[PDB]
Amino acid sequence: SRLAEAAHSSFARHETFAPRFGWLHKAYMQVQSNPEAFLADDAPVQLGVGKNMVYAMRYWSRAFKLTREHYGDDTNSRAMLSYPTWEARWLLDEDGADPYLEELGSLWLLHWWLLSSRPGTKSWAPSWYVAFHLAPFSRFTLADLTQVIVRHVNLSFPEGPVEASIAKDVDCITKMYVPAQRLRGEDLLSCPFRELGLMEQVGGSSEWEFTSGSRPSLPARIIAYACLDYAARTTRNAGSISLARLANEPGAPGRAFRIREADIAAALEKVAASHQELQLVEAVGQRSLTFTSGPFDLAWDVLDEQYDNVRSRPNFPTREDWARRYPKLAEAEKRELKQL
Amino acid sequence: DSRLAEAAHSSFARHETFAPRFGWLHKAYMQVQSNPEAFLADDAPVQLGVGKNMVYAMRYWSRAFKLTREHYGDDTNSRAMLSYPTWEARWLLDEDGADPYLEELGSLWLLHWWLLSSRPGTKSWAPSWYVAFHLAPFSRFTLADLTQVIVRHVNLSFPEGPVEASIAKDVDCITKMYVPAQRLRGGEDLLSCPFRELGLMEQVGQRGSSEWEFTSGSRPSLPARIIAYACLDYAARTTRNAGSISLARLANEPGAPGRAFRIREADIAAALEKVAASHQELQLVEAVGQRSLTFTSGPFDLAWDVLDEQYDNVRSRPNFPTREDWARRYPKLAEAEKRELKQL
């Protein structure tokens, strides 16, 4: 049951809103000192948005792995408070990697986090997971893709599908990834994920399709990071992962970024040239990415290099500093791990 | 032919091929609000959070989008051109303003209009853009073709001006600003540019074979009130009083919204009809028997009523400054306008 393994049962919690940059920015800025930022009586005024948008803002930060949620202490009746993740501190802080999402690679990174699943940290976007990793066809009507998601939810989640919520997810997917000109042609909002060029309307009319050209906006280091991060799901030590798996396995970068094996190989070779610990090797006649120590730390060496080594900046907190500052992050991870 | 000189200052390639970035507009605003030396300070790179080779481009983009004006400080021993935030930047970009995070596509249409904008005392900083949108005789071109058209205009308009290499860098920047990122080649690499969402420019039958075009479909992301504001703002360039301007001029005249937004006369008419229904001061009238937009009072103030309405009347918010309040806080803005007016 691939979907249940990969994702939480979360549908239409974006309240029909696609991501906005100002939402990601303002959520981080507020949640850092205030775990009650989204629950507060005057959250709408404090965050500068309407009531349903507070909800959508809270959801998007959880979905992009920028916050985790956990029970409050008892003064707080165990309300679901939000805490920023170390990754949010790394990416979005004013002294971080890319606080204004100036580089297209940072949007590819957020897209990877949205789809990402690991033991203890499942995806909050099962409809996105299905669309990219599990769906049978690259071209579909919105009703076709709604139906495909409904069918997986039937198989994966006991409470089962709420069709109207899944159809809302499919609307939201299209608003997130397709150019604005194709959206029912004030009213229209920006969405920076359209820059990824992942989805197009078929000349809706009434079909949509995921694209398949080359991806010049996707940096080699982002691909290499995602490959090592994927290998890290299952291994903590030196080892290897086949290019075939990286290209084709549901959940991996080939299907997440919609890129072919040859493109993954090209990126890995480019990056391995800069990292002694990384190689692309042949063993008749299949290529593999090799790493001489645990792939998660190496993924982060590669990723941090892309952004000129944010971790070495004055007063940048380590993952362990951050865990002591926000102990409920590990408690939330542990709560998920208990379910498995 | 001196249209380009009349419209624009002689400024080429000062962005060094960096297309606009949201982070640059935002952080420039936040810094210049209190520090006129924000782009000149020794610590500017750290303070602005940009690379040393990005400081000037960031400064340029704020001036070009009409978000700052520059003028000498009161300094007695300085030729240094200091920067001051415009009232428009306070209205648009402030945390308390119309759209600080550019969440609405209308706000990028607006910025595009401001980049192209020229009136007495406030000419455009982007001559290459002005030629590309308003003076070029073609909509489909190779980059070489566009470069040659700009060169022709620069020869006619600026006896002194730029080398060809600078104009080619403007053409490169115009492409990165407006075409989908997928058409671009990094040599990291590609930056986001929110103006790509306007869908104004596209690659055509690639190979190889080098070609691009300004697009000509309908524009669902371009709000009617942004169209109407632009029409009235355009009219305001030449009149301060009740008057009119024909739909044909709005659609076709170099500088006007038809060429700036690449929309048809019918589209402009439909937007003005929607906006005129709400505004008793505005009408569409047939005279011979061509249609005109009429206004019973000065079009600049009406343009701003229509534009502020589009953003839920920011000017009504508690403690929002009038232009006069802002002028008293930044007297160098009017000083800069006066200097330019003195040249005409």
Q: Taking a C-beta distance cutoff of 8 angstroms, is the pair B89, B61 a contact?
A: no
Q: How many CB atoms lie within 10 A of CB B104?
A: 22
- Residue B269 Cα, gap to closest chain A Cα (Å): 17
The phi and psi torsions of A223 (rounded to 5 degrees) equal -60, -50
In chain B, which residues have their Cβ closer than 8 Å to the Cβ of A188? 104-106, 220-221, 223
CA atoms within 13 A on the CB side of B286: 1
- Helices B224-236 and B105-116: crossing angle, nearest 10°? 20
The phi and psi torsions of B140 (rounded to 5 degrees) equal -115, 135
Show the CA angle centred on residue B222, arms to residues B219 and B223, nearest 5°: 130
Pick from B97, B106, B30: which is nearest to B68 by CA? B30
B295 DSSP β-pair partners: B243, B282
- Residue A106 Cα, gap to closest chain B Cα (Å): 9
Q: Taking a C-beta distance cutoff of 8 angstroms, is the pair B45, B51 a contact?
A: yes
Core vs surface per residue A142-159: b (16+ CB within 10 A) or e: bebbbbbbbebbeebbee
CA–CA dist A174, A178 (Å, integer): 6
- Residue A145 Cα, gap to closest chain B Cα (Å): 25
CA–CA dist B203, B136 (Å, integer): 18
- Structure tokens that stand for B251 in this block: 């659609």
Pick from A212, A227, A298, A309: which is nearest to A266 by CA? A227
Which resolution, in Å, applies to this structure? 1.6
Closest partner CB to B184 (pick from A20, A103, A216): A216
- How is A5-20 classified by DSSP, letter by letter? HHB-S--STTTTPPP-
3-state secondary structure (DSSP) of residue B286: strand
CA–CA dist B3, B246 (Å, integer): 21
Measuring CA to CA, how many Å separate A61 from each of A94, A150, A228, B175? 17, 25, 24, 33
Q: Domain A220-308 class?
A: mainly alpha
Pick from A5, A308, A320, A328: which is nearest to A156 by CA? A5
- The CA R_g of chain B, rounded to the nearest whole Å, is 20
CA–CA dist A87, A104 (Å, integer): 17
Show the CA angle centred on residue B180, arms to residues B179 and B181, nearest 5°: 115
Q: Taking a C-beta distance cutoff of 8 angstroms, is the pair A70, A83 a contact?
A: yes
Q: Taking a C-beta distance cutoff of 8 angstroms, is the pair B211, B203 a contact?
A: yes
In chain B, which residues have their Cβ closer than 8 Å to the Cβ of A48? 95
With residue A71 as reference, give the H or E element that holds it.
strand A67-71
Using omega within 30 degrees of 0 as the cis cutoff, is the peptide bond preceding B208 cis? yes
CA–CA dist A83, A77 (Å, integer): 17
Measuring CA to CA, how many Å separate B194 from each of A132, A173, A178, B19? 25, 19, 14, 10
Domain boundaries, chain B: 3-214, 224-312
CA–CA dist B1, B134 (Å, integer): 14
CA–CA dist A320, A322 (Å, integer): 5
Closest partner CB to A100 (pick from B21, B108, B181): B21
Q: Do residue A217 and residue B23 have CB atoms under 8 angstroms apart?
A: no
- Structure tokens that stand for A299 in this block: 């993924």
CA–CA dist A270, A314 (Å, integer): 30
Q: Do residue A195 and residue B196 have CB atoms under 8 angstroms apart?
A: yes
Q: Which of A93, A104, A271 to mutate to test the interface with B (most CBs of B within 10 A)?
A: A104
Which stretches of chain B are assigned E, i.e. beta strand? 68-72, 81-85, 140-142, 201-204, 211-214, 243-246, 282-286, 291-295
The phi and psi torsions of B107 (rounded to 5 degrees) equal -75, -30
- Residue B101 Cα, gap to closest chain A Cα (Å): 5
Q: Do residue B23 and residue A105 have CB atoms under 8 angstroms apart?
A: no
CA–CA dist A31, A93 (Å, integer): 12
- How is B93-132 classified by DSSP, letter by letter? HSTTSS-TT--BHHHHHHHHHHHH--BTTB-BS-HHHHII
A-B CB pairs within 8 A amount to 110
Q: Do residue A188 and residue B101 have CB atoms under 8 angstroms apart?
A: no
In chain B, which residues have their Cβ closer than 8 Å to the Cβ of A25? 101
Core vs surface per residue B265-288: b (16+ CB within 10 A) or e: bebbbebbeebbeebebbbeeeee
| Cα nearest neighbour of A302 on chain B | B188
Encoded amino acid at A256, one letter:
A
The phi and psi torsions of A42 (rounded to 5 degrees) equal -115, 40
Measuring CA to CA, how many Å separate A145 from each of A3, A212, B86? 15, 18, 48
- Structure tokens that stand for A78 in this block: 């165990």
The phi and psi torsions of B212 (rounded to 5 degrees) equal -140, 165
CA–CA dist A184, A164 (Å, integer): 19
Contacts of A19-22 with C-beta under 8 Å, sequence gap 24+, read: A19/A60, A19/A64, A19/A176, A19/A191, A19/A192, A19/A193, A20/A189, A20/A190, A20/A191, A20/B101, A20/B103, A21/A100, A21/A101, A21/A190, A21/A192, A21/B22, A21/B101, A21/B102, A21/B103, A22/B100, A22/B101, A22/B103
- How is B160-201 classified by DSSP, letter by letter? S---HHHHHHHHHHHHHHHS-GGG------PBP-GGGGG--E
Q: How many CB atoms lie within 10 A of CB B322?
A: 10
3-state helix, strand, coil in chain B (%, to 5): 50, 10, 40
The phi and psi torsions of B275 (rounded to 5 degrees) equal -75, -40
What letter does residue B52 receive in the DSSP assignment? G
CA–CA dist A115, A230 (Å, integer): 11
A121 DSSP β-pair partners: A118
Query: How many helices and strands (H and E) does chain B possess?
Result: 16, 8
Interface of B with A (CB under 8 A): 21-23, 26-27, 49, 95, 100-106, 108, 180-182, 184-186, 188-192, 194, 196-197, 199, 217-221, 223, 225, 310
Q: Do residue B188 and residue A306 have CB atoms under 8 angstroms apart?
A: yes
- The CA R_g of chain A, rounded to the nearest whole Å, is 20
The coordinates were experimentally obtained by X-ray
Measuring CA to CA, how many Å separate A60 from each of A20, A36, B311? 9, 16, 25
Q: Do residue A190 and residue B310 have CB atoms under 8 angstroms apart?
A: no
CA–CA dist A98, A107 (Å, integer): 10
In chain A, which residues have their Cβ closer than 8 Å to the Cβ of B223? 186-188
- How is A117-146 classified by DSSP, letter by letter? -BTTB-BS-HHHHIIIII-S-SEEEHHHHH
Residue A195 annotated as lining a ligand binding site: no
A282 DSSP β-pair partners: A287
- Structure tokens that stand for A141 in this block: 């009507």
Closest partner CB to A216 (pick from B104, B185, B196): B185
Considering Cα of B94, then B96, then B90, then A176, what sign does the dihedral take?
positive
- Structure tokens that stand for A41 in this block: 């009586």
Options 3.30.1490, 2.60.40, 3.30.70, 1.10.10; CATH for B224-312 is: 1.10.10
Q: Taking a C-beta distance cutoff of 8 angstroms, is the pair B211, B204 a contact?
A: yes
3-state helix, strand, coil in chain A (%, to 5): 50, 10, 40
In chain B, which residues have their Cβ closer than 8 Å to the Cβ of A197? 180-182
What letter does residue B134 receive in the DSSP assignment? I
CA–CA dist A246, A256 (Å, integer): 10
- Residue A187 Cα, gap to closest chain B Cα (Å): 7
| Cα nearest neighbour of A22 on chain B | B101
CA–CA dist A300, A304 (Å, integer): 6
Encoded amino acid at A85, one letter:
T
Closest partner CB to A188 (pick from B186, B188, B220): B220
In chain B, which residues have their Cβ closer than 8 Å to the Cβ of A183? 220-221
The phi and psi torsions of B178 (rounded to 5 degrees) equal -110, -20
- Structure tokens that stand for B296 in this block: 């019973």
Closest partner CB to A192 (pick from B190, B192, B199): B192
- Structure tokens that stand for A277 in this block: 């610990």
Checking DSSP bridges between strand A80-84 and strand A67-71, what pairing results, if any?
Answer: antiparallel
Measuring CA to CA, how many Å separate B308 from each of B25, B97, B107? 20, 10, 12
| Cα nearest neighbour of A186 on chain B | B223
Q: Do residue A197 and residue B191 have CB atoms under 8 angstroms apart?
A: no
In chain A, which residues have their Cβ closer than 8 Å to the Cβ of B177? none
Q: Do residue B191 and residue A103 have CB atoms under 8 angstroms apart?
A: yes
CA–CA dist B229, B98 (Å, integer): 15
Q: Taking a C-beta distance cutoff of 8 angstroms, is the pair B251, B268 a contact?
A: yes
| Cα nearest neighbour of A182 on chain B | B220
Q: How many CB atoms lie within 10 A of CB A138?
A: 12
| Cα nearest neighbour of A304 on chain B | B188
Q: Taking a C-beta distance cutoff of 8 angstroms, is the pair B70, B56 a contact?
A: no
Q: Do residue B103 and residue A306 have CB atoms under 8 angstroms apart?
A: no
Show the CA angle centred on residue B115, arms to residues B66 and B191, nearest 5°: 105
Measuring CA to CA, how many Å separate A290 from each of A218, A238, A274, A280, B260? 22, 8, 14, 6, 53
CA–CA dist A194, A179 (Å, integer): 6
